[model samples]
Target chain A: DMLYEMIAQDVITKKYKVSDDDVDKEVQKAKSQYGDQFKNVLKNNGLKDEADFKNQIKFKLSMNKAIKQSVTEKDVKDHYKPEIKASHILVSDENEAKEIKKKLDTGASFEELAKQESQDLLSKEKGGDLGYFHSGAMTPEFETAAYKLKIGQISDPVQSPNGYHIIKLTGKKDLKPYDEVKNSIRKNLEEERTADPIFGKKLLQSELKKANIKIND
Target chain B: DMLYEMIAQDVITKKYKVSDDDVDKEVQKAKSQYGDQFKNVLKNNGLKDEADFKNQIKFKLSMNKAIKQSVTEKDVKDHYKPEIKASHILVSDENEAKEIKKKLDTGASFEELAKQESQDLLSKEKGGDLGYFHSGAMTPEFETAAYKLKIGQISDPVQSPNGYHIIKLTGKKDLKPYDEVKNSIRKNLEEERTADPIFGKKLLQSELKKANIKIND
Candidate 1:
C-alpha cells in the first residue's frame, strides 16, 4: 500500500518515468538483493514486480504542483518589512541621562550631552551616533520610541531595559513607498490570507484526496 | 618595529595562541559548567591552563593508527552487507531486457548472470545488491531501485538514467555494528613557546635597537 502511494506520487510529479517492463526490471533487481524470502513477501502482497511500483509515482507530483501554485513571491516580502532600524534611550533611573535630556530641552548641546552621559558605551563614543539601523535591529521599547520620532526631534524619556533614554531623531527613511511596493505587498497579503495552519492542512488534504490516496495505520 | 615584526611573524606562521589567563578562565568556566568529571578529566591530562588548547594538534597521530587497524566482523556486518544485497541487470536496449526476462523464465540465476553480463562496474562485481539504507538514503534512482526490491528476488531490468539495473536484496538489519569508524583521538601537536606579540614586539625593538617606534602612528 505504501509502495502504491509512493509510485503514484512519483508519477504525478514526473519523477518516475519508465515503461512497465522497466519497472519489472527494477523489481527483479530488488528481489535479487534480499533473497527469495523477501521476494515471496512482496509477491504475496501483489507487489511482485515493477508494474505495481509505477502507479505510486503519479500522486506525489500532483501534491507538489498544488503546493507550488499557492505560494507567491509577494508573500515572502510582506514578512520582511515590519522589522526596521530603530534606537531608544530609557530614563527610568539614571539622573545623568535625565539631566542630559533637560540640557537638550533648554537648548544645550544634544550630542555633547549624549556623549557625556549616555550609558550605551557602543554609541556614546561617536557623540551618540547610533548609526543608520533598520527595524528589528533594536529592542521593542527602543524601536517604538525611535519610529515615533520625526526628523530632528528630541523625544521625552522612554523607559526600557537600561532605564530611561531621551531619543533624538537624527534621520528617518521609509523602506519603500506604497505604490512602488504594492505587488510584493499583495503577494504577502495573499499568503497572510492562507496563513492559518488549519486552512493549509485542509488545502493539502483536498489535493491529496483528489489523488485518490488512502492512509493506513 | 619589534612589535610589527612579532605581529607579522604571528600572522605568517599562525602561531598566535591565546594567553594563559584566557585558557585558565575557559578551563574554570568549563569546570563550573561541565562539573567535576570534566575538571578531573583535564587534571588527569595535565591540561592546567590555556596553553593546553594546542593539544588539538595530536589528532593526526590517532587518525593514522585508526586506519591501520584490520577490518573486523563489525566492519563486514556494517560495510560489506550493502555490497551483497544490491543487484542490477545491464541491457543495451529494451529488446535485450526482454531477452534477459526470457533467460530468467528458463531459470537463469540473477547473480551468475550479473557476474557474467551486468555492465555496472561496481554492482557487477557483487551481484548488484547495493545494501541496506535508512529512509531518504541514496540517490533518487538508487533509492527507488533499493526500496522496490524484495529480499531474494531479482528485478527484471530497472531502467534508470544511469542504465539498466537488476536489483537484489540479501539482508538488512536495524542497527549497524561498530569497527567501520575512524578514531578521532590523537593528532600532531606543534608548539612554539613564545611571548605574546604585543609584548614580544616591545622586547625585540628594545633589544635590537633597529626598529622605529612611534605611538601616535
Candidate 2:
C-alpha cells in the first residue's frame, strides 16, 4: 500500500502543488500538538531536518488535495446521520418485563426503577440509557422498537435474543456539529480514493484474470 | 534534496526494480545490527512494517545500485593509505631534552625512559606510543620528524606547538584487511553519493542563483 503511494508521490507533488506556506501550516499544527517533542519526534522518525519532514507533508497535502477538492462541504454534510439516544429496561423473565412495563406506564420513574431492577449491569446504573449512537450499532429489533417510540414514551415489552426490553426513545437529533464528523468524512474519501481505476491498471497482471476484452488486432 | 528524490521515486521504484529478496537482505542486515531493539526502533522511525521498511531499502538499493557498479574494488584499493604508528618523548626544558637525547644515545630504553621523563601525561603511561594513525592527524613538525627516521631509529628533539618531543618512527605498513576497511569504504561512497549533480539541479531554485546561461528568446 505504501509502495504504490510513495511511487505515485513522485508525480503527484509536481502535478498537485503545495506551497512553503502549506507545509508551514502543517508543521505549526504538529508544533502545537507535540510542543517540545516535535524535533525529537521527527528525529526518531529518521527525518534529517524540517525540510525532510516537510517533503513528506507536502506529498501528503498534494495527494489529499488531488482528492480533497472534489469532496466539498455539501458532500460531507449530505452523509450526516441524525444522532439517536435511548434508554432500555431489560429482564430475562417475560412476566418480570411485563411488571416493569406496567410500573413505567403507571408513572414509576424509569431511572429509579431501572437502578432498582433492570438486568443490564451497565445501562441499568444510568437508568437503562443506551447513550448516543448512529443507525447501525444496536440489534435490528431493539433499534426499531426504540425508534418508533416518541420522546418520553415507554415501549411495551419487546423481545430480542438477549432479553425482553422496554425502550424509552429519548432523542432523535440532527448530527453533531460539522467539525465533529469532518475527519470521518475525509477518511471515508481516502478509502474511496483507492477505488479510482488508474492504480489498478498500473498494478494488475494479465496473468491473474482472463483476458476477455476484444482485441484491436 | 529529499523532495526531488521522493518525487523521482514515483518513477525510480518501477524503473529500477528491486526484488523482494533484495529488500529481505537489507532487513536481515539490520536484524544483526540492532537485534532485539529492531522492531521498536523501526516503530519509532514511523515505519509501518517490514514491508514499509523494505520499500525504503529497495529505493536505497536501487539508487545505490545505479552508482555502486561503477566504483569497482580496484577503485577503493587505489585510495588506501599505508597505516603508521609512533612514540615520542616530551619535556619542556631545552637541556632536559638534551639530557634525554644523551640517555637514548647511551642505550637507554625509549619506553622505560618515556615512562619516567615524558611530561605528556596521556601518552607517558603507554611509553609515549601514539598508537595507530594515518598521514594527516599529527602536527607538521612532529609528523615530518617521525617519518624521516628508520623503523627502530630515534630522532633528535623536534618542536611543535604543544611541546618539544624526541621522536621514533614506528609503523609504516599496508592498510587493514579489506573487510575492516569495507565499512569505511561504504561510508565514503555513501558520502560521495550525495554529490550526484542530478540532486543539485533539482533542488537549486532559480531565485537563489544567477541565470547566466544564454537565452535564445
Candidate 3:
C-alpha cells in the first residue's frame, strides 16, 4: 500500500501533479518500514533515495504482472500433456540397432535388452526409463516412437543423435488430477482469462495517446 | 539516519520517554518524509504499512557503519597497487619452451611467435600484451616477472599456472599520470586513506549510537 502510494506519487509527479517532498516522504516511509533489509538492498547497490529506486520498483512490478498474465489453464492442459513415460536403447550402427530389434521381436524383453546393451548410461541403469516427459522435451524421433505406442507397447529401433533407440511405453495418465499441478493451472488460467498476451500493448498505447504525454521516438 | 532516530525513539520510549504524542510525531514525520517511497515499495511487494519500517532503517544504518569503519587504510593499500601487463604460453615441458627460446635467440620476434603459439587467447590477439594491470591483477609468478622487468626487457622463459612464457616487457605508466583515471584514482586513494569505504556511514552510526539504543533482537 505504501509502496503503491510511492509509485502513485512517482507517476503523478511526472505524469500528473505530485511534489518531490511527498515522493521523498513516501520513500522515507518505505525505508523506515523495511529497516535493514531495505537499507541493505539500497546499500548493496549504493543507491540513496533516488528516482531510479522508484523506477526499479515500477518496472519490476509491470514485468512480473505481465508474465503472470500470459500463461493460461487451457494452454497448460492442451499444450503440455502429450508427453509420455518411455525408454530407449541408443546404438551407433543402424545394423546393430536392427540386430537389437530382432532380439526384441523374438520375445527378448525390451527392459532386458535396454539394461544390458543401451549405451546411454543414465537410462541403461533404470532399463532405459527416461521418466515422464512433456512435448518438446525429447528428440523428435524418440517422441514420435513413444507417442505412436499404446501403453505397454515397445518400439522397433529408432535412430537419433545419441544413436538408435528401441523405445518402450510404460504408462499414460489423464492430464487432469495432478494435485501438485493444480496451483500452477489455476494461476495460468487466471492469467489467460484476464490479460491480452498480444496486441494489448497497442491498445495501451492508444489509451496513453489520449493523455497529455508526448514522445520523442 | 531516520532509522537511527527510530531506534532512539524506541529505546527512549521504553526507558525515559513514555509519550504516544512523541511517537506519533516521529511516525508522522517518517511518513511525511518517506511515505511516498515507502507506499510504492510496499505496494510493489504486495504489502501494506502494517509493519514498523523506521526501526529497520535504524538497525541497518548501525550495522553498516560498524562494518565499514573496521576496514583500515593499511588494509586498502595492502590490497591496492599498480597492475602489470603480462602474458604466457603453456607447454607440456620446459624443453619445448627452451626450443622456442632458441628461436627467440635466433632473432625470431617474441610477439610474432607468441601470437602464433601462445595458448592464452586472452592476450594472444594483442600479440601477448595483457594490457596495463595493477599488483593484484596478475598471478603471482606472472606479476613477479612483469614488475621486475625494465621497459623492453624480456624475461628468460617464466613459468606460472598458465605455462612457460618468454614475457617481453611492455611500456609502463603510473595510474596518476592520466586525467581519464584521476577521478577514480582519487576516489580509490580517498577510500584507501580514510579506511572507510562506507564514507558517510560512521556519522550515521555515531548519531544513532549516541541515543540510548537497544535492539530487540
Predicted model with the maximum DockQ: 2
State each model's CA lDDT, in order: 0.52, 0.71, 0.60
User: Quick one: ranking by DockQ, best first?
Assistant: 2, 3, 1
- Number of the top candidate by TM-score? 2
Give the distance in Å from residue B134's predicted Cα in candidate 2 to where it truly belongs. 51
| Candidate 2 residue-wise lDDT, B76-104, digit = tens | 66445566788989988878888899999
Model 2 chain A worst lDDT run, 10 consecutive residues: A208-217
Tell me how much of the true interface, by contacts, candidate 2 captures. Answer: 0.22
Candidate 3 lDDT score relative to the true structure = 0.60
Please, what are the lDDT tens digits per residue for candidate 1 over residues A168-206?
A: 777655567656765665554445444555544565555
For candidate 1, give the DockQ: 0.00
Candidate no. 3 TM-score: 0.29
For model 2, residues A1-217, the per-residue Cα lDDT tens digits are 3434443444566656889898889989988888999999999988879876887898778766766555667766654556689998888999999999888888899998888888899799998898987643566688778777888889899999889998898888866777988778666654565465543333222211222211110
Candidate 3 residue-wise lDDT, A176-199, digit = tens: 565667675556544543454443
**Which pairs clash in model 2?**
A7-B10, A10-B7
Total clashes for model 1? 92
- Per-prediction DockQ, in order? 0.00, 0.08, 0.01
TM-score of chain B of 2: 0.45
> Stretches of candidate 3 above 4 Å error?
A1-74, A80-84, A90-99, A116-122, A132-141, A157-164, A174-217, B1-217
**What class would a CAPRI assessor give candidate 2's docking?**
incorrect
